[PDB]
């Protein structure tokens, strides 16, 4: 119920990170299959075969039979090496990669939640609404009744009432808009959830800009995965330089044979060698070569592998400039929240001062009910549009914390402490 | 020129669907070379080679003049059957993904057709607006001339006469910009189009939630395709399993070959082993293998097929709960466009009354023409805004038609039933 | 500091430019490998292995002693130069990509510039605003210290107060922000750029539209990639076609042997046959295959690829359309640039003689200095909206002249004409 406990719920709910993290999984266990090759084939296979060599040697018939495993273990050859260290950075990227998601579900949670609160706000605001301009159809069509106003302003009052109906169904129906928002990172309704404590705000300070800087040089999740993306494209270019490596190989197997002759042509001085057999054999040994030169093959590879690795070079620098970007934007957007959120509080405290002055105005009955209730109106609208400042000031709590690339569950229990009454969601 | 006509021409001129359509035709044909490896593989190589040993046995010249076909037939390997039936799948796949683009084409066509209706209307009342406020200018004009009002007023006056020029041209523009929308979709521009009989509006009800729920569940394309991404997945975990067969196979060859001897070590004691070759061979027989264990070969993609399965149904389900928050979210958004519809209604009702009423008041001439037409202007402002309303719950009765994963030409054709008079478009 | 060197120095900045720069880069020398299999191809492969015979076969060891050079060199096969041709319309791909982004980088520049611009603008204006605003606050305020009026006034005038300062805060911040996003292009702040010189603003009529659709036929480079993918689809036909080809190709190569016996067995009888020999040799012929038939490889792809081709066709025509669109769109915004130019430059007219008037007001004290700050407020606001609007002037001729696929640095000194007085960034 508590946003702590909506992160606990959601911490399994999402399919994304646990999809992201299976394929995490998917990469290091891709690593097990990226160290095997070096290991050794044990092979088998078999084979029988007649055969019958018409014309000149015409008339023999033999058919053929044999079998053999084939062990075979190459020993000299880098480039498998280099494509496991590939897949380690790559690896790498997918664990980073995934940590970003993380954040993100942070954020949308976070998000999601607050969008409830403000949906609440809003409905109950555009209801208090609709009693005032309720009340002021009936005030202004009892005068048509006793026939002090034109029929005109009676329909002008029955608009309004019917324009604030609008009002009421499209929020009402904007809350479960925003209640199935949260159950999309959930996959459960919630009867209710907690206010925001406003009376212990935290207007904190936020922190110089520069050191906020450096904590972002060193901590971005993305910048980090390009600069793994820079490490991959050297591993690309030393991967084509291994083109020119000598190939050192030891093939291992034995074989049996059988073949048995056939046909009148073996008849009549078959000289043993026209004879059945019945050899077997264990052949073990070196295997070897070397491309010498393959029309220039490992070699436009080489260019190739640079201007891979330049332009990744570039991306990363893209990543540089963006992140300042952010983060510079971020902290400014902060400073706006802080202010916006001075400019509502003191418009709260308009809003009520000039409502409680007319509330002493019915006092004496100046003025009607209706009225008030203008003022009301006014009053709530200014009280939780200044609330959803504060929550923008949230947002934007997170999203320099996200700037950094940090970001804990931690953070988010900070922001638990913030919450206080229950409420009921509709 | 009524909405199924541009439907009809529309259902030709769209590449993207012709385009998905041949797609599925490629999914489809793609099948039958899936098919193929399983037949027979004739062939055939001939080829000549001269030939000139040394050292030890130097000098003894020769030259092979090899020729032969080779026909090949595997018998057993599922691996095959099991691309086979991803092939298969795939192509139910793009089947279903064709179908949901058709109903893409129709919700376009309708919207862009509604558009420029919209468009229309604005433009008209607009045009309206334009003349008042011109003899607005006119008459202040005059007031400066008879050495009334000071002059500030007048070019206020001015202010408000340009400003209009320039919702009319900026109007006129969207007009024909929408016009070119639809000639995108249809390749054709169009002189008029039907306006709606809004005299006879379809107020109906909404179906209760849980129906429409259990019916979108039942039958929408996006679900549907993700399921046989998971039927697709379970194949390719099989497909990891097939590593394990043994491969049945049966080779069957013939030709011949005469290699000529030449050079002087031929010469003396011959042997008719040194004599020209002249033989031919007929060669058929089975060729079996069994991999045995090969350094986790077929293993780590076992694990990275389970993998590639439980992301896929983490994309399922995901898929499953934005259906739910879709459906829900469109039912909402028919409600909306009920009481939208209602509150316009009204509003027409009321600007109506105040402009008769203001009609009275020139009829012994109280005010002028030009107020007349600003009620006029608000009038009909509220008028095909309200229009602009009707065409939302249409566009809304095609989208929860959408999420359905039905939608037909019918639909369509009791919209066309809901088309009226004919309206010139520029 | 003009728009001319801010483009100068950002011209080498961009990464993106210079990363499809280097792609460019690969795109060709990619076809140098592209020719390379025509070459011959050098090499060789020494290797060494025992031997132990058995059953029937047994005991006689021996080890083979193995050493062969292999060159060898096709003669026919089109296939290769099919896709070499293949690989040279992908050049020519990348390099209208390369275009492509040569102005979009262009674009972007020309408009943060002018971004700035207007940040600059609002800022001063807003600041006046904020200056108004205070001393109608303190007007109240020192009215309730004589007690004039209701403290609510008081309070309203705070708010009004606050919530200038507000927007103050945050227009200041999107000064910098604008800065940063200058900075992303460039990698440099710059303290001031030149203001725009607005006496000698140009109002050029656009060409006619059909004019412009003809020239807009020759080269948007969109289109032209288009059709350079369909001439691609059409190299992948004749290149499913060449499937048929027969490979004429040519064998020679050249080696030692050595392989030593060892064993009992080889003892007696010897018969030369079971003695070491150290041969060597010098194969060179001819290779040819044909595959007759293949179980339908070379057939499904047909009409694999005559679906690319029509796919792509559609593509084409899609880009026709959007291309119309566009340039349609472009013109159409160039007239409602011009049209709202001429509107805000008569309010501007009206809200100057209004100041002056007001002015003159306080001549002879009729009313308060804010007021006329009032005006001067509703001034600037319309001077640099105005000053806006003739950005949006100059962005839409960037427009026009971008749909025709041309653009170059010429237009934008063009615009440098534009530039005057220097000014302060912050």
Do not use: C
């Amino acid at each position: 119920e508590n946003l702590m406990q909506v992160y606990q719920q959601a911490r399994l709910s999402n399919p994304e990170l646990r999809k992201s993290a299976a394929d995490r999984d998917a990469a290091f266990e891709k690593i097990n299959e990226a160290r095997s090759p070096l290991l050794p084939q044990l092979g088998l296979g078999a084979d029988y075969t007649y055969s019958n060599g018409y014309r000149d040697a015409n008339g023999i018939n033999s058919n053929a039979t044999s079998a053999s495993l084939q062990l075979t273990q190459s020993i000299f050859d880098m480039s498998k090496w280099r494509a496991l260290t590939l897949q380690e950075k790559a690896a790498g990227i997918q664990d980073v990669t995934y940590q970003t998601d993380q954040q993100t579900l942070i954020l949308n949670t976070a998000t999601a939640y607050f969008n409830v609160l403000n949906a609440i706000d809003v409905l109950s605001y555009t209801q208090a609404q609709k009693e005032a301009i309720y009340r002021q159809l009936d005030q202004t069509t009892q005068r048509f009744n006793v026939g002090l106003v034109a029929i005109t302003d009676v329909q002008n009052a029955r608009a309004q009432y019917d324009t604030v109906l609008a009002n009421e169904l499209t929020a009402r129906n904007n809350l479960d808009n925003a209640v199935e928002q949260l159950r999309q990172i959930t996959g459960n309704y919630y009867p209710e959830l907690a206010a925001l404590n406003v009376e212990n705000f935290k207007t904190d300070k936020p922190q110089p800009v520069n050191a906020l800087l450096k904590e972002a040089e060193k901590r971005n999740l993305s910048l980090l995965q390009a600069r793994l993306s820079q490490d991959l494209a050297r591993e690309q270019i030393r991967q084509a330089q291994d083109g020119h490596l000598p190939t050192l190989d030891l093939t291992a197997s034995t074989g049996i044979s059988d073949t048995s002759y056939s046909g009148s042509k073996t008849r009549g001085a078959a000289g043993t060698q026209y004879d059945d057999s019945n050899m077997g054999q264990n052949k073990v040994g070196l295997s070897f070569s070397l491309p010498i030169y393959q029309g220039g093959m490992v070699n436009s590879q080489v260019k190739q592998a640079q201007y891979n690795f330049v332009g990744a070079s570039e991306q990363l620098e893209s990543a540089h400039r963006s992140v300042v970007q952010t983060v510079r934007s971020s902290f400014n957007n902060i400073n706006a929240s802080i202010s916006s959120i001075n400019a509502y509080k003191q418009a709260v405290v308009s809003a009520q001062s000039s409502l409680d002055a007319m509330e002493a105005g019915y006092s004496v009955g100046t003025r009607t009910i209706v009225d008030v209730l203008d003022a009301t109106t006014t009053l709530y609208n200014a009280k939780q549009e200044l609330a959803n400042a504060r929550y923008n000031y949230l947002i934007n709590q997170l999203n320099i914390k996200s700037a950094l690339g940090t970001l804990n569950e931690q953070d988010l229990l900070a922001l638990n402490n913030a919450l206080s009454k229950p409420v009921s969601t509709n």
